[PDB]
């Protein structure tokens, strides 16, 4: 197999997941789009992953394990390309760099999706790079994934890695402005503050919490190099100005309840101290004032109730259920089912709040 840059090309274009996840079609995936099983059983998926890696992964792998799986998928894709009468001639005629761009296309839309580009594939086989580049840019493929497609088209146009190398340069230069002088592999307190100033935002603002959600950031006041790089590439941003222009779109998303729920639940995980399962009361109230502002009539009376009668950490389930509480609760609390399944804390809040109307 050893006799046969591509891993980094697809790490950028598709993304690398180190934890077992469900893909669009609902299948159990890991690494760079590696399918584990067609089975709806996570036990089966973990069994497949464990067998393939050779350890009890519990659904979590290293980047090197993800690479082992990725090289197997490249080999399978190449074999499939070679058994395809519409793809084999083009593939055989292409240099190593342009073959990687073709394998990239197969990874995205499959063999049938790629074979549909008959005129463009012909131009590539004929080494009419300029004509192929203009023709591939007319497709829906160019509008569905503009950033990825432009990179792939550039690879076919030049036969160089310049699209990927130049994106990494621009992001590394941008990163250097924010990295911690005491720790090059992370963005510190000062760096996060600088990042927020460049965006003309306060670090305690909702816009910055929305950005953290979009970057899938782990914890408040922490920002790793990997979070910065992966976040900027996935969002299709190579500058602060480009990130700034994405903010209205992120805002509109939150008008849809499913997205808002995902953001609201993410806030708890982001806000809490690593190593702690719960969220300290003072911090829970400060984040509730940000995310439930204009969504919960009883927000202040709730904060007052907790500061005076709870005075302890907020568990994740209670945090999640407060959103459902705020949505259904009548202004007079008459529809509250006290004989229901709400946390004891919410039952106690209703009991405390009801005499005060
Ligand atoms: C970490 C900081 C230390 C404690 N400080 C208070 C007194 O003791 C010493 C100093 C802290 O907990 N501050 C609370 C504050 N949080 C924030 O301002 C955060 C800061 C950010 N963290 C990140 C991480 C990553 C990113 C990237 C995705 C760009 C950005 C930011 S900003 N902001 C937020 O969490 C956004 C709302 C309070 C803010 C208001 C809500 C309560 C906590």
Q: How far is CA 6 from CA 13, 88, 153, 160, 337, in A?
A: 11, 19, 15, 12, 57
Task: Kindly report each contact of residues 181-188 with a partner whose C-beta sits within 8 Å and lies 24 or more positions away, as own/partner.
Answer: 185/224, 185/225, 186/222, 186/223, 186/224, 186/225, 187/223, 187/224, 187/225, 187/228
Residues 6+ apart with CB under 8 A from 53: 61, 65, 68
Residue with CA nearest ligand 1 atom 36:
209
Which value, to the nearest 10 degrees, does the dihedral of the CA atoms of residues 98, 104, 107, 111 take? -30
What is the helix (H) or strand (E) element at residue 297, kind and residue range?
Answer: none
Measured from the Cβ of residue 250, the count of other Cβ atoms closer than 10 Å reads 17
Is the four-CA dihedral 263, 265, 268, 270 of positive or negative sign?
A: negative
Q: Which atom of ligand 1 is nearest to the CA of 289?
A: 41
Q: How far is CA 145 from the centre of its chain?
A: 15
What is the helix (H) or strand (E) element at residue 264, kind and residue range?
Answer: helix 257-271
Q: How far is CA 37 from CA 40, 41, 75, 106, 114, in A?
A: 8, 9, 18, 20, 24
Helix (H, G, I), strand (E, B) or coil at 272: coil
Q: How far is CA 327 from CA 292, 321, 352, in A?
A: 11, 10, 19
For residue 220, the CA-to-ligand 1 centroid distance in Å is: 5
Annotated resolution, angstroms: 2.1
Q: State which of 221, 229, 287, 288 you would mutate to test the pocket of ligand 1, scoring each by most atoms of that ligand within 8 A of its C-beta.
A: 221
Residues 6+ apart with CB under 8 A from 348: 305, 309
Q: How far is CA 151 from CA 231, 242, 286, in A?
A: 17, 17, 42
Looking only at Cα atoms, what is the longest distance across the chain? 82
Residue 18's nearest CA partner among 10, 27, 29, 9 is 29
For residue 295, the CA-to-ligand 1 centroid distance in Å is: 22
Q: Return the half-sphere exposure (C-beta side, CA atoms, 13 A cut-off) of residue 326.
A: 22
Strand-pair partners of 34: 30
Which value, to the nearest 10 degrees, does the dihedral of the CA atoms of residues 234, 254, 263, 227 take? 20
DSSP state at residue 37: E
Helix (H, G, I), strand (E, B) or coil at 186: strand
CB 197 within 8 A of CB 261: no
Domain that holds residue 101: 5-162
Q: Label each residue of 187-234 as H, E or C.
A: ECHHHHHHHHHHCCCCCCCHHHHHHHHHCCCCCCCCEEHHHHHHHHHH
Dist. CA 295–CA 313, nearest whole Å: 22
* Residue recorded with tokens 């945090």: 319
CB 178 within 8 A of CB 195: yes
Per-residue burial over 51-89, b if 16 or more Cβ lie within 10 Å, else e, is: ebbeeebebebeeebbbebbeebbeebeeebeebeebee
33: left (phi over 0), alpha (psi -120 to 50) or beta: left
Which residues form ligand 1's pocket by a CB distance below 6 Å? Answer: 192, 195, 203-204, 208-209, 211-212, 215, 217, 220-223, 283, 286-287, 290
Q: Which atom of ligand 1 is nearest to the CA of 203?
A: 32
Q: How far is CA 14 from CA 33, 104, 156, 290, in A?
A: 8, 9, 18, 32
* Residue recorded with tokens 């953001």: 263
29: left (phi over 0), alpha (psi -120 to 50) or beta: beta
Residues with catalytic roles = 14, 23
For residue 191, the CA-to-ligand 1 centroid distance in Å is: 12
Dist. CA 130–CA 64, nearest whole Å: 37
For residue 270, the CA-to-ligand 1 centroid distance in Å is: 10
Task: Kindly report each contact of residues 145-148 with a partner whose C-beta sits within 8 Å and lies 24 or more positions away, as own/partner.
Answer: 145/108, 146/236, 147/236, 148/13, 148/108
For residue 291, the CA-to-ligand 1 centroid distance in Å is: 14
CATH number at residue 49: 1.10.530.40
Residue with CA nearest ligand 1 atom 28:
212
Q: State which of 177, 198, 204 you would mutate to test the pocket of ligand 1, scoring each by most atoms of that ligand within 8 A of its C-beta.
A: 204
Dist. CA 149–CA 159, nearest whole Å: 15
Measured from the Cβ of residue 136, the count of other Cβ atoms closer than 10 Å reads 23
What is the helix (H) or strand (E) element at residue 344, kind and residue range?
Answer: helix 344-353
Helix (H, G, I), strand (E, B) or coil at 263: helix
Structure tokens, 30: 């890991």
Residue 313's nearest CA partner among 350, 354, 273, 351 is 273
Residue with CA nearest ligand 1 atom 25:
223
Dist. CA 191–CA 221, nearest whole Å: 10
Helix (H, G, I), strand (E, B) or coil at 5: coil
Dist. CA 58–CA 1, nearest whole Å: 28
Dist. CA 31–CA 328, nearest whole Å: 40
């Amino acid at each position: 197999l050893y006799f046969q840059n591509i891993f980094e090309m697809l790490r950028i274009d598709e993304g690398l997941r180190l934890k077992i996840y469900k893909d669009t079609e609902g299948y159990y995936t890991i690494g760079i789009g590696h399918l584990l099983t067609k089975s709806p059983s996570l036990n089966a998926a973990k069994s497949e992953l464990d067998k393939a890696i050779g350890r009890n992964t519990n659904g979590v792998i290293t980047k090197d394990e993800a690479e082992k799986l990725f090289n197997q998928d490249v080999d399978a894709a190449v074999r499939g390309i070679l058994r395809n009468a519409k793809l084999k001639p083009v593939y055989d005629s292409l240099d190593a760099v342009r073959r990687a761009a073709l394998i990239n296309m197969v990874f995205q839309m499959g063999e049938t999706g790629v074979a549909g580009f008959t005129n463009s594939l012909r131009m590539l086989q004929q080494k009419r790079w300029a004509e192929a580049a203009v023709n591939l840019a007319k497709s829906r493929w160019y509008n569905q994934t503009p950033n990825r497609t432009k990179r792939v088209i550039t690879t076919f146009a030049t036969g160089t890695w310049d699209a990927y190398k130049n994106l990494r340069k621009k992001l590394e230069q941008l990163y250097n402005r924010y990295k911690d002088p005491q720790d090059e592999n992370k963005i510190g307190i000062d760096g996060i503050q600088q990042f927020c100033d460049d965006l003309a935002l306060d670090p305690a603002s909702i816009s910055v919490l929305i950005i953290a959600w979009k970057f899938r950031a782990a914890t408040q006041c922490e920002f790793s190099k990997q979070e910065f790089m992966d976040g900027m590439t996935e969002l299709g941003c190579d500058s602060i100005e480009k990130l700034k222009a994405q903010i209205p779109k992120m805002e509109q998303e939150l008008k849809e309840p499913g997205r808002f729920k995902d953001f609201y639940q993410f806030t708890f995980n982001f806000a809490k101290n690593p190593g702690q399962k719960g969220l300290d009361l003072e911090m829970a109230i400060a984040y509730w004032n940000l995310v439930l502002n204009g969504r919960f009539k009883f927000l202040d009376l709730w904060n007052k109730f907790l500061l005076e009668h709870h005075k302890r950490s907020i568990p994740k389930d209670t945090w999640n259920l407060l959103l459902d509480f705020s949505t259904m609760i009548a202004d007079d609390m008459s529809n509250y089912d006290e004989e229901g399944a709400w946390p004891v804390l919410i039952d106690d809040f209703v009991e405390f709040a009801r005499p005060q109307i």
